[PDB]
Amino acid sequence: ETPATRPVTGSWKKNQYGTWYKPENATFVNGNQPIVTRIGSPFLNAPVGGNLPAGATIVYDEVCIQAGHIWIGYNAYNGNRVYCPVRTCQGVPPNQIPGVAWGVFK
Structure with missing residues (x-):
């Protein structure tokens, strides 16, 4: 697995990649702008899965912070992360x- 071993930060915890994450199941309703989605990893340098249409409702199970951005981790129908x-997130x-x-985050 390799996460943060010690009880640290409570909600947020850092994984092996140095990405801060938290397990959170919410619905992200994309606003008025299409967003570039990634696969496997929450980075701008990560493989792109496509763009998320504006107004799409995403059910995610995780929130991550990396590349100055806050990301939501969800799975696609192909099992893609x-x-x-x-x-955005200034800092960690x-x-x-x-x-x-x-x-929106429902």
């Missing part, structure tokens, strides 16, 4: 600074 950037938690969301 799709990461959609949902907002616990002192994270999340920018405006590109949608």
